[PDB]
Amino acid sequence: QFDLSTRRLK
Amino acid sequence: QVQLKQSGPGLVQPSQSLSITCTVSGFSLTNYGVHWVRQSPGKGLEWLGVIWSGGNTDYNTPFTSRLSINKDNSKSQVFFKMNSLQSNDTAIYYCARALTYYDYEFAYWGQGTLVTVSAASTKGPSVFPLAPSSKSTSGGTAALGCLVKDYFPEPVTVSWNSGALTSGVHTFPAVLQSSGLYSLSSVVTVPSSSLGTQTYICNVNHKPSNTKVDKRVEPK
Amino acid sequence: DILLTQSPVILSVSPGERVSFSCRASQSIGTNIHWYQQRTNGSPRLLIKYASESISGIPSRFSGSGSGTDFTLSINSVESEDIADYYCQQNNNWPTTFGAGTKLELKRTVAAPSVFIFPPSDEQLKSGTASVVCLLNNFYPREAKVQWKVDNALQSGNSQESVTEQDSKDSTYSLSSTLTLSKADYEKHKVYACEVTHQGLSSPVTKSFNRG
Numbered sequence: 431q432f433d434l435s436t437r438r439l440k
Numbered sequence: 441q442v443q444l445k446q447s448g449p450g451l452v453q454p455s456q457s458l459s460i461t462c463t464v465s466g467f468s469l470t471n472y473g474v475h476w477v478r479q480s481p482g483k484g485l486e487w488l489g490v491i492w493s494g495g496n497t498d499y500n501t502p503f504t505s506r507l508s509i510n511k512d513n514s515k516s517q518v519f520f521k522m523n524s525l526q527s528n529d530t531a532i533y534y535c536a537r538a539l540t541y542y543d544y545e546f547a548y549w550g551q552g553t554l555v556t557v558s559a560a561s562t563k564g565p566s567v568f569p570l571a572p573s574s575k576s577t578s579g580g581t582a583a584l585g586c587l588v589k590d591y592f593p594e595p596v597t598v599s600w601n602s603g604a605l606t607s608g609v610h611t612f613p614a615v616l617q618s619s620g621l622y623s624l625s626s627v628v629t630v631p632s633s634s635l636g637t638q639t640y641i642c643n644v645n646h647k648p649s650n651t652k653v654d655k656r657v658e659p660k
Numbered sequence: 661d662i663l664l665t666q667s668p669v670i671l672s673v674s675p676g677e678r679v680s681f682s683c684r685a686s687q688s689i690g691t692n693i694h695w696y697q698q699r700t701n702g703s704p705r706l707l708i709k710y711a712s713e714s715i716s717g718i719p720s721r722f723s724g725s726g727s728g729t730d731f732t733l734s735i736n737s738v739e740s741e742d743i744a745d746y747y748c749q750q751n752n753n754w755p756t757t758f759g760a761g762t763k764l765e766l767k768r769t770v771a772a773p774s775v776f777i778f779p780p781s782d783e784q785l786k787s788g789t790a791s792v793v794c795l796l797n798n799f800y801p802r803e804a805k806v807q808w809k810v811d812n813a814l815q816s817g818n819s820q821e822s823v824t825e826q827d828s829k830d831s832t833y834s835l836s837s838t839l840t841l842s843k844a845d846y847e848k849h850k851v852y853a854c855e856v857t858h859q860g861l862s863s864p865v866t867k868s869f870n871r872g
Contacts, residue, residue, distance in 0.1 A: 432481050432761075434532060434554060435594060435613045437701050438825055439669075439745045439763045485704070485747060485758035500755045534703060544751045545694045547715065549703035568784040570793055575869050576776035583776040587784070587791055587838075610797070610834045612822035617840075624822065625836050627795055 442466035444474075444535050444550035448647040451556050451593050452525050460553050462518040462535035469493070469511055472541050474518045476509065479552075480531035491518060493541060525557045556593035556648075563621060564651030565591035567644050570625060571660045577632050584657050585627035586642035590619070597645045598626040605630075605640070635659050662686050662750050664759035672765045673738050675831075681733040681746050681762050688728045689752035695724055695733045696747045698761075700825040704747065708733060740766055741828045768831040772860030773799035777867040780846065790846035792839040794854035794867065798832040805857040806837040809868075811849045815839060846871065 433440045447461045462474060476488040489499040491509040499507045506523040518535060533553045536546040570576075570585035577583070588596055598611050611626035626642055635658075644653045663686040673679045683693060691711035696704040706715050708724035711731060724733045735742055743766055748759040773796035780790040796804055802823065808815035819839045826833060837854065853868035 432479060432484050433613075434481065434530070436825055437479075437532065437552075437698060439761050484760050485749075487756045487758070539709070544749075544756045545706060545709040546696075546704065546749075547706045549705075552703055566784075566787065568781045568791070570778040571781065573778075575867060576778060576795075578774060578776075581774075583774075583795055583797065585778070585793075585795075587781075587793065589784075589791065610824050612824060612834075612836045615820045615822050617820070623820075623838070625793055625795075625838070627797075627834075627836070629797065 442537065442548045444537065444548060446533070446535055446550040446553045449554040449556075449593075449595055450648045451558060451560070451562050454526060454557055454559055455524055458520070458522040458525055458529070458533075458555055460520045460533055460535075460555075462520065462550055464516045464518070464537070467537070469513045469516055469518065472537050474509075474511070475536045475538070475544070475546065476520050477534045477536055477546070478531040479534070480528065482528055527557045529555070530557045531555060554593075554595050558593060560592055560620060562649045563590065563592045564646050564649035565589055565596060565644065565653075567642065567653045567655040569655055569657040570627065571657060572630075572632070572635060573659060580632050581629050582632040582635060583627055583629050584640060585625050586644065586655050586657060587623075587625050588644055589623045590617075590621040591623075591646050591649065591651075592621050593648055594622060595647075596622075596624070597647070598624075599643045600626075600628055601639070601641050602643060661755060661757050662689060662753050664748055664750055664757060666746075666748060666759040666762045668762065670763045670765060672767055674767045675740060676737050679735045679738050679764065681748075683726075683731040683733070683748035683759055685729045685731075685750055689750045691727045692750055692752035693724075693726070693731050694749040694751070696749065698745045698747065699743075699828070738764075738766065740831050742766075743826045743828050743831070766826060766831045768800050770860045771798060771800045771832055773797055773804065773835070773856060773858055773865075775854065775856050775865050775867045777852070777854050777869060779852070779869055779871070785843050785846070788843045790841040790843055792841070792852050792854075794837040794839070794856075796835040796837075796856060796858075798827070798830065798834060799858060799860060800832050801859065802833050803859070804835055806835070807855040807857075808837070808839045809851075809853040809855065811851050
């Protein structure tokens with residue numbers, strides 16, 4: 431799932 | 441070189457409309473199509489549409505009615521406008537360009553625009569120092585930082601000494617507090633013997649609220 | 661639309677090892693597939709186009725193969741800067757679609773955190789709120805416990821943690837734990853303690869201070 435804060439999949 | 445620079449991040453009220461401007465350089469809009477892609481938690485990467493060299497547009501099927509892309513060739517600007525945003529439209533929005541004028545292999549991307557869809561209000565952060573001390577020094581290395589508290593929406597940019605200090609810097613991902621405001625720290629480790637000689641300043645820029653603060657961080 | 665399925669969700673490898681990313685398509689798409697790298701806080705960077713063709717400025721260690729429904733992005737010898745998410749894109753069928761991505765994590769040797777503690781600033785106290793920050797710097801692996809104690813009372817539920825993405829240079833993580841109080845509560849107590857547990861430490865490390 432993509433995380434807008436880090437721009438990474440978490 | 442080839443560059444795409446998008447407008448700043450911001451908050452958009454639910455049911456309201458989103459506007460982003462993609463300003464290009466290093467090529468001409470009359471020769472290349474410009475594509476729009478977004479990246480959400482729900483759907484990941486998702487191609488939205490394109491405006492071609494000659495001004496024609498295609499819109500991905502789910503967006504034909506709420507999406508318009510326009511441009512000004514002489515100004516090298518492409519304008520994205522989406523209507524009736526719901527909260528799951530919260531995403532990073534990119535403009536992109538392919539290698540060849542008709543293709544879709546996106547070799548050049550904008551920096552992205554984080555758009556938050558929420559009913560709340562924009563609020564700038566307060567910046568507090570994380571002062572170096574003996575409790576933050578080991579083997580001639582001191583840790584120090586800035587606490588960037590109570591802002592909305594994401595993102596906030598943090599740098600040190602106006603860009604000249606980058607090594608040993610950790611800026612933590614923001615966390616949402618019960619208040620619905622975000623908070624983060626940015627830290628950096630330096631040689632402790634430089635504390636008496638060098639100034640340390642975190643530069644905080646919260647674009648959505650147009651708040652820029654430089655916080656000098658000193659031993660106490 | 662074509663569904664692209666990337667497997668697995670997460671890869672964990674050691675530097676120098678070869679690594680492979682899989683992309684499967686819901687029907688044949690020939691060789692119409694592109695691959696991208698997304699680094700922490702970055703935009704997608706194009707790695708390979710049309711299954712196997714190279715891109716200007718992309719290190720040679722990157723390559724791709726496949727046709728039909730089954731495709732592979734390879735790194736022949738992983739470096740720490742390869743820490744990223746990887747996405748495939750098909751464009752045989754309109755509209756162009758992307759896979760959900762695979763995360764590349766790097767292993768390294770255990771590294772114990774350096775632990776620093778920061779009292780609330782006088783500046784913050786004027787606002788009537790107190791933040792006590794405990795920093796765990798450059799450690800591996802990611803798992804760690806932080807236990808707050810105020811005058812020996814165990815704290816629970818009044819702290820938040822943030823962990824950085826993996827470091828592109830040394831493959832470590834850093835963690836912050838922030839204990840939040842009112843000014844009034846903070847002034848009522850003396851000893852603020854942050855206890856850290858991690859695989860790299862032979863015993864829990866405690867950093868603390870006395871208010872004033």
